[PDB]
């Protein structure tokens, strides 16, 4: 009876493939053919943020587009004032092994997590004047690879146990559990309306989840290796995934399959982080080859290179107003670019 | 100066944060990082216990004015290639192998062979090209009596030696050491421990001292 279900699943996959092929009449490279190229994009380093002593694994900007938070293996979570390079805060982490960090949209809280399988939320605005560990969320059986704030009380976390979770912070319990991935979930991105979110895993697939229902709406499979990063398009109707096969891929939610592939012959290293510009026309991707490329999202042509780091570019972020792009690498330096 | 009074005070706060970060980094850089690895039931628990006597589990201890950190990844059920680069730059790797596992199977093949496979994966990993391994061959007393009645030929069909502790143990050590492809960059320290010995932390101290001497010679350019 198991074979009957297996053949039903494979014929349903064939139906999925045929349905996707039916709704593919012209490629993206044909529609974006006569549009003007972006041209060579020269972005120079405006600020360099020093003070981390080990390799940096994550960063997040925040809504004010001025402050930012960075997490490093030295055990410090540093909130920087990017305009003046001042260190607003330096939180000593309980566990030195941190590989994700998020900054709340309100700015009152900051989250971190890593190999300790715990998501720690710290209260930045305390009456005592210090930064206290507001909450410790436990329940994942694998390392926390990403975490994003829905609001001051709800947080979505992805873990290496092939599972995502939605937590109510004040209660500390998992409001919802998202299952279906067969590999470690490496990154997640929240929709602009924060009602859906996409998670990329090590099974070379990306899944779209509904926050309310808790179920997976769509699955996208175009990569040939581990998906390390994911990011929605600004309009929320598409997303981009960077993987270990040295390719990025733009997928569409409404059409349900892949739109564009961003790759180059001389690029053979994986992508650690992807991000979109304010208008979505530029896709910025950090690579293992010490660099960070800037692709034309519509034309797939490479538009620029951000070569300023002496080690792997591990984290990448773009401000909400789009003024600057911050890249944090394994040489313990963040760099602001315009 | 264009700064305001509040801006000057913020810069002073940033400078204090800088000096506290420098002090914390100076304190942490004087501490030895050991990554503890091994198969299930190899004897990592016994090693952690012996060090204590003299997600991720961290063990702190002190010996001869050196502070030692062990990171027992242990119950981290995930792909090692997604988080093993976090431990690049540790002072040493402590690998635990159970000798008694030479004739035990999980699958239907010897546990010693998974020990060899994971040792080959870790020793020859691209991140740990310069990191030195500290191989622990635990359960010497169990092996000494197992070998008297169960030939080593179960695990090694090509072993032509006698069923004696010394020859079989040397052969197993040689088989594990042959998996080292980075002979010139890294060196492997092998110690034959048990559950009832007290010289393990001394051996870790000596191996770490040798690693520190070699690292200092590299820093000076004399190596």
């Amino acid at each position, epitope marked *: 009876e198991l074979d009957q279900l297996r053949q039903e699943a494979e014929q349903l996959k064939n139906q999925i493939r045929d349905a996707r092929k039916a709704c593919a009449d012209a490629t993206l490279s044909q529609i974006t053919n006569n549009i003007d190229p972006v041209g060579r994009i020269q972005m120079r380093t405006r600020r360099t943020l020093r003070g981390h002593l080990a390799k940096i694994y994550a960063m997040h900007w925040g809504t004010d587009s001025r402050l930012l938070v960075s997490a490093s293996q030295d055990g410090k979570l540093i909130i920087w004032d990017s305009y003046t390079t001042n260190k607003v805060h330096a939180i000593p982490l309980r566990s030195s092994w941190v590989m994700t960090c998020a900054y709340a949209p309100s700015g009152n809280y900051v989250a971190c997590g890593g190999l300790d399988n715990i998501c720690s939320i710290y209260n930045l605005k305390t*009456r005592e004047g210090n930064v206290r560990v507001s909450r410790e969320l436990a329940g994942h059986t694998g390392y926390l690879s990403c975490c994003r704030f829905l609001d001051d009380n709800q947080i979505v976390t992805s873990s290496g146990d092939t599972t995502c979770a939605l937590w109510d912070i004040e209660t500390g319990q998992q409001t919802t559990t998202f299952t279906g991935h067969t590999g470690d979930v490496m990154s997640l991105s929240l929709a602009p309306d924060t009602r859906l979110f996409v998670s990329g895993a090590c099974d070379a697939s990306a899944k779209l989840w509904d926050v309310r229902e808790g179920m997976c709406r769509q699955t996208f499979t175009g990569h040939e290796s581990d998906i390390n990063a994911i990011c929605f398009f600004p309009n929320g109707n598409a997303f981009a995934t960077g993987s270990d096969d040295a390719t990025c891929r733009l997928f569409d939610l409404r059409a349900d399959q892949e739109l564009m592939t961003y790759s180059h012959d001389n690029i053979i290293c994986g992508i650690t982080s992807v991000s979109f510009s304010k208008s979505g026309r530029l896709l910025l991707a950090g690579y293992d080859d010490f660099n960070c490329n800037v692709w034309d999202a519509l034309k797939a042509d490479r538009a620029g290179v951000l070569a300023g780091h002496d080690n792997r570019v591990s984290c990448l972020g773009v401000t909400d107003d789009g003024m600057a792009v911050a890249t944090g690498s394994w040489d313990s330096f963040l760099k602001i670019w315009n | 100066c264009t700064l*305001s009074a509040e801006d000057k005070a913020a810069v002073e706060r940033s400078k204090m944060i800088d000096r506290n970060l420098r002090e914390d980094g100076e304190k942490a850089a004087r501490e030895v990082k050991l990554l503890l690895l091994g198969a299930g039931e190899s004897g990592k628990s016994t090693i952690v216990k012996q060090m204590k006597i003299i997600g991720i589990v961290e063990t702190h201890f002190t010996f001869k004015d050196l502070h030692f950190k062990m990171f027992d990844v242990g119950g981290q059920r995930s792909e090692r290639k997604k988080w093993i680069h976090c431990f690049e730059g540790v002072t040493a790797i402590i690998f635990c192998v159970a000798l008694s596992d030479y004739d035990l199977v999980l699958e239907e093949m010897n546990r010693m062979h998974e020990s060899m496979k994971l040792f080959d994966s870790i020793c020859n990993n691209k991140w740990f090209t310069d990191t030195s391994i500290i191989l622990f061959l635990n359960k010497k007393d169990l092996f000494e009596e197992k070998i008297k009645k169960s030939p080593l030929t179960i695990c090694y069909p090509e072993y032509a030696g006698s069923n004696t502790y010394e020859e079989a143990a040397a052969y197993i050590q040689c088989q594990f050491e042959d998996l080292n492809k980075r002979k010139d960059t890294k060196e492997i320290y092998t110690h034959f421990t048990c559950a009832t010995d007290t010289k393990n932390v001394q051996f870790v101290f000596d191996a770490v001292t040798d690693v520190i001497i070699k690292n200092n010679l590299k820093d000076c350019g004399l190596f």
Partner: single-chain antibody
Framework: DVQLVESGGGLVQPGGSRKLSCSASGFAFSSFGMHWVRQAPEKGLEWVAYISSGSGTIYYADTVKGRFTISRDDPKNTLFLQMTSLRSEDTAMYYC??????????????WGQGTTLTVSSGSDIVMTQATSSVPVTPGESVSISCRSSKSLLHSNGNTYLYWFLQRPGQSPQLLIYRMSNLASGVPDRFSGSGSGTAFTLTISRLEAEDVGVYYCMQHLEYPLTFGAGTKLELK
């Protein structure tokens, strides 16, 4: 919660010496700069001294420079003001005020209870509060105006204006910091506005506990100066 206690005040002969101690609890004392602020018996507030976190920078008012010395013991969580050559014009109530400085912080957040000292028998921004007092009725709207000799708007866009309320028999309370931002725990009735040298504080639907003296403060050029104060009384 956070609380500061002032001690060491009393009757002192002219030309004498005294030691005022502010003991802090409930907050990270080492991370806060500390101000000593003076209030004469029948007059308004006047800034006296300041010592930063880590004692890196120390400032005094030109009135008390040389005679007064401010220090802090972080492990003891205490703040000292040593006063020498006491003049008859130093008789007043002294407050220790905590103040933390980073991006988006609220300096002068908490004031101490104050200790009473009774001495027995240009180039500074002049904040002007023209109106000494106004009559008010509960449920109405009142506006308290302020003026500055020099523009308080900096090149970084921050307008360094602070508003305080001192209810009768109580220490001053921070309402507005940097001319726009509401302090934590302050009702949203109070709103700060203005630009450059002219400033105003607006209270909408004032309640019975809004009765007191409202002070105008600048934080741009470091010789900190207060306004004369604008008393509010009912009818």
């Amino acid at each position: 919660d956070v609380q500061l206690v002032e001690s060491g005040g009393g009757l002192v002969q002219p030309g004498g010496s005294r030691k005022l101690s502010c003991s802090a609890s409930g907050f990270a004392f080492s991370s806060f700069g500390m101000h000593w602020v003076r209030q004469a018996p029948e007059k308004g507030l006047e800034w006296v001294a300041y010592i930063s976190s880590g004692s890196g920078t120390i400032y005094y008012a030109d009135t008390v420079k040389g005679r007064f010395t401010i220090s802090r013991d972080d492990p003891k969580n205490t703040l000292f003001l040593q006063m020498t050559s006491l003049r008859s014009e130093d008789t007043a109530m002294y407050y220790c005020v905590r103040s933390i400085y980073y991006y988006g912080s609220s300096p002068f957040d908490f004031w101490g209870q104050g200790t009473t000292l009774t001495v027995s028998s240009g180039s500074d921004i002049v904040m002007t509060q023209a109106t000494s007092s106004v009559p008010v009725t509960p449920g109405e709207s009142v506006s308290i105006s302020c003026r500055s000799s020099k523009s308080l708007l900096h090149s970084n866009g921050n307008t360094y204006l602070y508003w305080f309320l001192q209810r009768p028999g109580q220490s001053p309370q921070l309402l507005i910091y940097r001319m726009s931002n509401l302090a934590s725990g302050v009702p949203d009735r109070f709103s700060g506005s203005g630009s450059g040298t002219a400033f105003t504080l607006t209270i909408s639907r004032l309640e019975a506990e809004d009765v007191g003296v409202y002070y105008c403060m600048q934080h741009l050029e470091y010789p900190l100066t207060f306004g004369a104060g604008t008393k509010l009384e009912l009818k």
